[PDB]
Design a protein around this ligand. Structure first.
Ligand code: BR
Ligand code: CU
Ligand code: CU
Length: 226
């Protein structure tokens, strides 16, 4: 009924993102399931507003680290599940090198028996024919490490990491992420020692789906504490 107890089996997920990049407005809805005992997420996302103005891979990090697999010996370092069901606010600034910036604010919490991630995203200062609004990024997403640290001042957790997006010409587009998470409720939460999350992500399509969409499968495991 609280915290890690809510994640002992498969949990259904709803995601909603309201976005605006250089004034291009869009809306994304995602649905599927997560299982934190194995660290597995399975989700399908649809743009309801027509063709997205940015590449799907640039939205992956924004679109529920509560589904990370924390090994038994690291369970006291799992902030994300400890904040549940009331949830947490997740905020980022994402700097695309030599291009624009996204700022995001999300609330991740339970809604009934479902976990929901509700997001607002604003992007500014993008190049219209750059790698992002020019759609020059490959449809894939490579493995990354996200180091997590406690943010005691605020009873939450911070992370800083750089996503490397492959570009169609063989170059790499860097996206520097700054993240802060805050609990929504004022019950106690776990504040972790430094550790990281290891992620893999594979992106695919539904050949029967006519809307602009992304099918995603991810495995994530926490590590770095022995
Ligand atoms: Br931030
Ligand atoms: Cu459902
Ligand atoms: Cu409802």
């Amino acid at each position: 009924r609280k915290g890690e107890e809510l994640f002992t089996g498969v949990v259904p997920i709803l995601i909603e993102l309201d976005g605006d990049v250089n004034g291009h407005k869009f809306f994304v809805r995602g649905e599927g399931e997560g299982d934190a005992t194995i660290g597995k997420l399975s989700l399908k996302f649809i743009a309801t507003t027509g063709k997205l103005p940015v590449p799907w891979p640039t939205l992956v990090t924004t679109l529920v680290q509560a589904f990370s697999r924390y090994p038994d010996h690291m369970k006291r370092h799992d902030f994300f599940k400890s904040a549940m069901p009331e949830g947490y606010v997740q905020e980022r600034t994402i700097y695309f090198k030599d291009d624009g910036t996204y700022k995001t604010r999300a609330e991740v919490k339970f809604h009934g028996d479902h976990l929901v991630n509700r997001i607002e995203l604003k992007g500014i200062d993008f190049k219209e024919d750059g790698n992002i609004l020019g759609h020059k990024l490959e449809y894939n997403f490579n493995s990354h490490k996200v180091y997590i640290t406690a943010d005691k001042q605020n009873n939450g957790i911070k992370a800083n990491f750089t996503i490397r997006h492959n570009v169609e010409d063989g170059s790499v587009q860097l996206a520097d992420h700054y993240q802060q998470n805050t609990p929504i409720g004022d019950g106690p939460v776990d504040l972790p020692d430094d550790h990281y999350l290891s992620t893999q992500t594979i992106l695919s399509k539904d050949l029967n789906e006519k809307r602009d969409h992304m099918v995603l499968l991810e495995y994530v495991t926490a590590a770095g504490i022995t």
